[PDB]
């Protein structure tokens, strides 16, 4: 399927144990997609002071369209030293590995895979 319904655990930035997916734009997009498939991906909502507490390159989920079954359609965009790889809509948050942190909420998304 071109899209997959996921419910992403929303994590507090200070709880996150593994603060990124790797060391290159290509690696972080690869790892993010693998963790999204394996159900081991968390979401941090972006506010003032969040991104400096996480590791670059960043992987964002961005709104790809204006929401089937409650699921916002999203795609992945990476960012390294102020350059984004991909073009999409509004940021819903930054993806991180989930290793058992307790979420504050869930974000229903339809991921363009």
Curated annotation (Swiss-Prot):
Q: Which residues form a coiled coil?
A: none
Effect of changing residue 37 to R: reported as: In strain: Omicron/XBB.1.5, Omicron/EG.5.1
Its function?
A: Inhibits host translation by associating with the open head conformation of the 40S subunit. The C-terminus binds to and obstructs ribosomal mRNA entry tunnel. Thereby inhibits antiviral response triggered by innate immunity or interferons. The nsp1-40S ribosome complex further induces an endonucleolytic cleavage near the 5'UTR of host mRNAs, targeting them for degradation. This inhibits the integrated stress response (ISR) in the infected cell by preventing EIF2S1/eIF2-alpha phosphorylation upstream of stress granule formation and depletes host G3BP1.
This protein's name: Host translation inhibitor nsp1
Q: Where is this region: Disordered?
A: 1-113
Looking at the record, the residues that make up the CoV Nsp1 globular domain are 2-113
Q: Which cell locations does it reside in?
A: Host cytoplasm
Source organism of this protein record: Severe acute respiratory syndrome coronavirus 2 (2019-nCoV)
- Full-protein residues shown: 11 to 125 of 7096
Q: Name the domain of life.
A: Viruses
């Amino acid at each position: 399927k071109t899209h997959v319904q996921l419910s992403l655990p929303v994590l507090q930035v200070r709880d996150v144990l593994v603060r990124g997916f790797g060391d290159s734009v290509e690696e972080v997009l690869s790892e993010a997609r693998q963790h999204l498939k394996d159900g081991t991906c968390g979401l941090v909502e972006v506010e003032k002071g969040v991104l400096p507490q996480l590791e670059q390159p960043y992987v964002f989920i961005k709104r790809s369209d204006a929401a089937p079954h409650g699921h916002v359609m999203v795609e992945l965009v990476a960012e390294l030293e102020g350059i984004q790889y991909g073009r999409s809509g509004e940021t819903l948050g930054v993806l991180v590995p989930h290793v058992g942190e307790i979420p504050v909420a869930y974000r229903k998304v339809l991921l363009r895979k």
